[PDB]
Amino acid sequence: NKITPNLAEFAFSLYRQLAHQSNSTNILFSPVSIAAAFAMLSLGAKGDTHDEILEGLNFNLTEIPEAQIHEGFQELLHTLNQPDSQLQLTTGNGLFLSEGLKLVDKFLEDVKKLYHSEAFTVNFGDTEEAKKQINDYVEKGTQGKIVDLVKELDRDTVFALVNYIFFKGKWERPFEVKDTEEEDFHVDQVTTVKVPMMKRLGMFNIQHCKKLSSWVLLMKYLGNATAIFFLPDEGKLQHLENELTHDIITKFLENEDRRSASLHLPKLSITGTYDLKSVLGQLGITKVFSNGADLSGVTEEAPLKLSKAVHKAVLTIDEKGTEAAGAMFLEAIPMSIPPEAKFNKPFVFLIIDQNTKAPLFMGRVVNPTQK
Ligand SMILES: CCCCCCCC(O)C[C@H]1O[C@@](CO)(O[C@H]2O[C@H](CO)[C@@H](O)[C@H](O)[C@H]2O)[C@@H](O)[C@@H]1O
Numbered sequence: 001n002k003i004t005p006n007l008a009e010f011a012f013s014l015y016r017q018l019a020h021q022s023n024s025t026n027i028l029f030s031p032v033s034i035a036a037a038f039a040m041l042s043l044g045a046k047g048d049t050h051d052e053i054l055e056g057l058n059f060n061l062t063e064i065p066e067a068q069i070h071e072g073f074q075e076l077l078h079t080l081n082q083p084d085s086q087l088q089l090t091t092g093n094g095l096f097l098s099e100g101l102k103l104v105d106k107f108l109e110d111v112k113k114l115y116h117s118e119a120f121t122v123n124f125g126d127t128e129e130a131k132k133q134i135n136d137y138v139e140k141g142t143q144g145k146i147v148d149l150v151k152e153l154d155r156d157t158v159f160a161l162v163n164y165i166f167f168k169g170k171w172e173r174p175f176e177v178k179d180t181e182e183e184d185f186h187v188d189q190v191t192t193v194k195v196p197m198m199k200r201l202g203m204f205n206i207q208h209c210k211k212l213s214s215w216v217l218l219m220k221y222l223g224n225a226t227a228i229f230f231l232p233d234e235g236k237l238q239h240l241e242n243e244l245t246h247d248i249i250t251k252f253l254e255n256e257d258r259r260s261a262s263l264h265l266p267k268l269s270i271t272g273t274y275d276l277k278s279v280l281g282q283l284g285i286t287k288v289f290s291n292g293a294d295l296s297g298v299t300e301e302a303p304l305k306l307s308k309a310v311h312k313a314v315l316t317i318d319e320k321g322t323e324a325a326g327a328m329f330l331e332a333i334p335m336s337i338p339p340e341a342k343f344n345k346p347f348v349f350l351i352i353d354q355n356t357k358a359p360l361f362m363g364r365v366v367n368p369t370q371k
Pocket residue numbers: 215216217229230231263264265266343344345347
């Protein structure tokens with residue numbers, strides 16, 4: 001089990017970037033979805049463009065040969081897609097290539113082999129049809145969670161890359177709908193609304209960490225998955241965010257001490273949309289997003305470069321479990337206007353696959369959106 005330790009650090013790194021831009025908006029993204037897409041793309045990149053990408057994903061070529069990295073992803077992806085009898089989890093990569101655009105064989109085979117990618121040739125001259133195919137791919141993979149992902153597509157498009165992840169799990173310790181109650185929340189500084197709050201009194205695998213300055217709760221999903229929640233102490237949100245690390249989570253995953261407690265978890269339906277260019281730029285990956293981008297490993301008759309890279313994720317939480325989807329489109333997609341209002345006691349969460357110890361999703365909940 002390799003590359004998962006890097007994937008984890010990549011998560012926190014990316015999380016911290018989004019976290020220090022605002023502290024009053026909900027956050028949600030899939031490290032796996034983002035890492036798989038850029039890792040696969042690097043196979044067609046060269047020089048700095050290439051090195052910046054793998055390095056920006058928390059990979060150092062001096063510690064692990066590139067061959068093993070692309071290899072670690074191939075196995076990770078194979079393991080994540082292995083059918084689990086108790087939960088649903090799937091990830092897929094798709095390439096939509098322009099008919100008439102000459103490509104590099106080596107690239108087509110590296111992706112299909114290493115990232116189990118699917119290659120589709122489409123006519124981008126028929127923009128409505130090209131979008132439909134892409135959108136049908138994501139909607140099929142996200143089981144209806146994300147439909148009509150791409151609203152507009154450039155006429156001159158010749159290459160498109162999309163990644164999707166889907167997860168649905170049931171709490172081993174579910175809540176009771178009868179115990180859910182409407183509660184007051186300040187939508188703005190001057191008006192409140194009632195939102196559904198789930199409640200349950202019993203034994204929980206809770207604990208408190210000094211280094212993180214917060215309470216840590218573990219919510220197992222039937223299957224090989226788990227959800228860890230972090231409730232920062234007063235004024236210690238920023239502290240939690242910067243202190244989260246792979247090891248810490250490890251020291252907490254090996255604690256079977258459960259105590260009695262009254263859990264209050266709001267019914268949630270959150271989303272997250274981000275143009276990763278600036279954010280990933282902050283991690284060292286900038287060349288591929290510039291004109292000096294070298295992706296001559298994809299095609300030799302087009303000056304490929306990433307102009308935009310939007311990540312979209314949706315997560316629903318209720319009494320019985322969790323359902324979440326994520327998609328990565330390496331092009332333009334509209335941004336949303338998240339509502340900004342902190343209900344004083346925000347929390348961070350991380351959804352993890354016990355089989356590979358990989359972080360499927362990570363977020364921050366400050367607003368009880370029901371969207
Ligand atoms: C790791 C723990 C994760 C649990 C996170 C719970 C977040 C909330 O739901 C917080 C929210 O619930 C209320 C309800 O009154 O607070 C109660 O529950 C929290 C649970 O931690 C208690 O600490 C509070 O004392 C309770 O009042 C909201 O007021 C609160 O903001």
